[PDB]
Write a protein that binds this ligand. Structure first.
Ligand SMILES: [Ca+2]
Ligand SMILES: [Ca+2]
Ligand SMILES: [Ca+2]
Lengths: 230, 230
């Protein structure tokens, strides 16, 4: 039994359905915020949250870092303390330095100025490595990294709970604290980076979590809207 | 603009729709928890919340007292301190001792042992008295009772916020504290009462908020399930 906070609604994905796709489909059909679509296998955990923040898209993109912090907190509550989680700006997850899943984000609009009707954040997390020869960016899997005592259902519940904590704080105006939490977890800050066909040093982020990428002569601003799933 | 907490979804009632009925209709159609249907006029405020507590109906009935406490807290935050709010066991509201609206409750089942698929709590609050000659239990109206500086939209927002606070505490196991808050607001406790065709002294309530009604020779238990809208 998967128990979510009050006013979150869990829905297991059925045949032909995957969580991120289904949550987006349901969101476009008018299903409200608070839906958590999930799909658990022995080798993978997928889940997706439907949100509706009443701000322009530019600002609603903070839901990605917010749910990343949620995930880091959720795994830290369940895993051995030596397991390090870092968050890539683009939503990729790293466990003990290795690519191990990702957070995805979609919304009802791609205009930075428009308030979206909906936004969905999806988690994909490998639990055991898939060795079938399917193309993957993942370099490890959760249970390969010392987290064998972490149950997938409990991790899902915990992600939902910690995401809700940070989303509520974001709503109460605590963006600055969120920025600080996220900066401490950010992968590769201060280091070389290629992004959106540009290269430089990942200097940090602006208030809307846009990447500041400094090359030899200029600083590029890459808005976080660029990672929206099209 | 009516702003609700994150993961609450406001929906204004359209032509042919009223909040409590519509929320129940939508709930039976599968709309999840967190919907707040509302309808504001100059003379009346109506609203309804869709909930889905994962407990048997017997225990889910606590949502009525919970949302009553929510309302008392919400009005107290906005009204002059001399305005007294009391809660009837059956959901009726009293302002300065006079009947002035009510909370209603419905659910997907009437079996006390079954976990309901949904529960809806509705608020009906008169703002000015209706003098058209329509039959009403109400003896006053909010703006007749010194609350002219309370805006209906702000009261609605506040009800939603305070209900969510108490529903979250209920979920975290704080039933005992809820009982205490509710007992302090209860109308007519320790006094004569007629209920479900029985008469006696309203002694108090059991853990499931069932009324203990003591007559000359016995104590009746009236379960709160009896106030479910059929
Ligand atoms: Ca699937
Ligand atoms: Ca109507
Ligand atoms: Ca909802």
């Amino acid at each position: 039994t998967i128990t979510f906070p009050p006013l979150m609604t869990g829905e297991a994905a059925g045949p032909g359905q995957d969580p991120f796709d289904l949550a987006c489909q349901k969101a476009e059909l008018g299903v409200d915020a608070g839906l958590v679509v999930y799909e658990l296998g022995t080798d993978v955990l997928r889940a997706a949250l439907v949100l509706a923040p009443e701000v322009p898209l530019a600002k609603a993109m903070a839901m990605l870092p917010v749910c990343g912090v949620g995930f880091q907190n959720a795994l830290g509550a369940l895993a051995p303390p030596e397991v390090a989680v870092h968050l890539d700006w683009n939503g990729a997850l790293r466990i003990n330095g290795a690519r191990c899943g990702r957070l995805r984000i979609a919304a009802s609009t791609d205009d930075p100025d428009t308030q979206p009707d909906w936004l969905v954040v999806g988690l994909d997390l490998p639990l055991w490595p898939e060795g079938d020869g399917g193309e993957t960016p993942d370099e490890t899997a959760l249970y390969a990294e010392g987290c064998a005592d972490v149950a997938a259902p409990r991790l899902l519940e915990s992600w939902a709970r910690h995401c809700l904590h940070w989303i509520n704080r974001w709503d109460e105006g605590e963006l600055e604290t969120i920025h600080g939490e996220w900066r401490g977890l950010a992968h590769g800050m201060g280091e070389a980076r290629t992004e959106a066909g540009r290269s430089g040093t990942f200097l940090g982020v602006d208030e809307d979590f846009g990447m500041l990428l400094r090359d030899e002569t200029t600083t590029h601003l890459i808005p976080l809207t660029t990672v929206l799933v099209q």
